[PDB]
Amino acid sequence: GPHSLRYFVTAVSRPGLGEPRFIAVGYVDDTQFVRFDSDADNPRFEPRAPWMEQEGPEYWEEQTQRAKSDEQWFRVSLRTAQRYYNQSKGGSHTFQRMFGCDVGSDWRLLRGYHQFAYDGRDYIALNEDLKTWTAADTAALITRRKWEQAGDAEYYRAYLEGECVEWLRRYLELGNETLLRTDSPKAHVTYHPRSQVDVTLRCWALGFYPADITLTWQLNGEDLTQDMELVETRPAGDGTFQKWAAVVVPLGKEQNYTCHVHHKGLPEPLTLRW
């Protein structure tokens, strides 16, 4: 089956307060498994999932040292970034990196990532061919130019196709009990009085993993014309996720509405009437 290994890295400069905030989190699919927090009393990569606690000190020391090295790079990059743009000194700014690998069911690199954002906007990204770069603007062009000449594409392709995919395999083994599961959603509709003519119908999907889900309403079978509310999928706190979708329907007309739920853990899609 399809799986992914992702790191989400964040650095925030804080002038007058000390060195920048630096945090990296690691995910396999929708399950977090490692972290680095520069404000922690002792800065080190540490496990954030039960199945990672068995790893040897060599694992943790190499992870910690690769992160501390990345942190340093971010300090320079924040400074370099502020100069490239000609921004005012003294302000707080953000740098983000996302990298990792998606593999398909034939254990094959569907997509490798090495991309950056400055102040919440795209900066530079390694294209899908793992050979070329996309610069978001004339500042990033300077960086693209340097990374082209230095051969950074090949350096990270080697990582993306090797270490990344090789250790994704290992993580899936370590946590097979939890990672390879499909918790189906428990679904139900709730009824909430609004006005003297309308009423709210809310369709709930709870307790499911992975986080991808499809939740909608339809009237008699065709798509909606009204204005459905569909909230962001959200973590329950225990490794499962929640979502709901709501519609405002005419009193007396509630039976023409159905809620549909599609999920990887549902051998049949759900159809709920109130």
């Binding site: 964040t10 925030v12 905030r21 707080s92 953000t94 959200r234 973590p235 329950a236 225990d238 929640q242």
Partner: protein, 99 residues
Amino acid sequence: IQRTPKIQVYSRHPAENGKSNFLNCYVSGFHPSDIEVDLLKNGERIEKVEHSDLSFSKDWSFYLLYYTEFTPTEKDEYACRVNHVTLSQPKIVKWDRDM
């Protein structure tokens, strides 16, 4: 550029009185990442509330989960207080069992 946080207040397990649950406040889609989040019992600030590690979505916007163990009662009201650079004053979202 800035994004205002989305806020959701809810319980881990569905709400029934007397049962120890977990109270969640999920703030998402915000930028930058500096954010104030408190859990409130009857307008007062709850003390040892924990949060997830800073992470972000495909569009680079951040998300965090703030949580604390609690036992909901018939009486006690709960809420989440969020302040952020995008908000001209702290936003308070009350906990609703049905939402």
